[PDB]
Design a protein around this ligand. Structure first.
Ligand SMILES: Nc1nc2c(ncn2[C@@H]2O[C@H](COP(=O)(O)O)[C@@H](O)[C@H]2O)c(=O)[nH]1
Length: 186
């Protein structure tokens, strides 16, 4: 069917929502596997979480027009390829794209994808901050940066860019809303 673009700040539980969806409907949805130049992280699997590629290969991909969209984040490259999206869609599954607000804006200007847009918001920026500080892995400076980005995305969502906004203040309720949205059909 029409692909679904899901976006939202990291720390909102969005990865969990997708995990539940792929378990319950593994034959209905396919995940767009992004290409990235960043270093893999524990548990990540090449070809599943991401297509981890070199900088040379990423530059090559750009030059050969292999992307639907691409961006940099923290000095590394990320992008959605034409290939991954067609192998899934071709496959007969509904393609889900997990990309940031730059990606959303890019796909919006591709009328032919006819994508649907869903944004997963945090219950508040103050709660997002707590979660981020609660993990112990980032600096003061990186959290300020992520909070500014989250604020930007919340502001963009108020222009009505997304088909639906879901506030994830409970995993199972957001999961509900997610299903109601997706299976609305179009
Ligand atoms: N535009 C774009 N953003 C992406 C893509 N893949 C991942 N991102 C994003 O880049 C950020 C960093 O992802 P991480 O490195 O944490 O996996 C997140 O905002 C995430 O949504 C993609 O293919 N395109």
């Amino acid at each position: 069917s029409r692909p679904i673009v899901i976006s939202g700040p990291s720390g909102t539980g969005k990865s969990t929502l997708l995990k539940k969806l792929f378990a319950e409907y593994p034959d209905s949805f396919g995940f767009s596997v992004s290409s990235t130049t960043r270093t893999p992280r524990a548990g990540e699997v090449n070809g599943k979480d991401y297509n981890f590629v070199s900088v040379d290969e990423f530059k090559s991909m750009i030059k050969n027009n292999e992307f639907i969209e691409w961006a940099q984040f923290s000095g590394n490259y990320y992008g959605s390829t034409v290939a991954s999206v067609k192998q899934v869609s071709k496959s007969g599954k509904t393609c889900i794209l997990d990309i940031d607000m730059q990606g959303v804006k890019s796909v919006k200007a591709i009328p032919e994808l006819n994508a649907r847009f869903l944004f997963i918001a945090p219950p508040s920026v103050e709660d997002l901050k707590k979660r981020l500080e609660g993990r112990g892995t980032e600096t003061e400076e990186s959290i300020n940066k992520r909070l500014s980005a989250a604020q930007a995305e919340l502001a963009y969502a108020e222009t009505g860019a997304h088909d639906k906004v879901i506030v994830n203040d409970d995993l199972d309720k957001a999961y509900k809303e997610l299903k109601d949205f997706i299976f609305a059909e179009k």
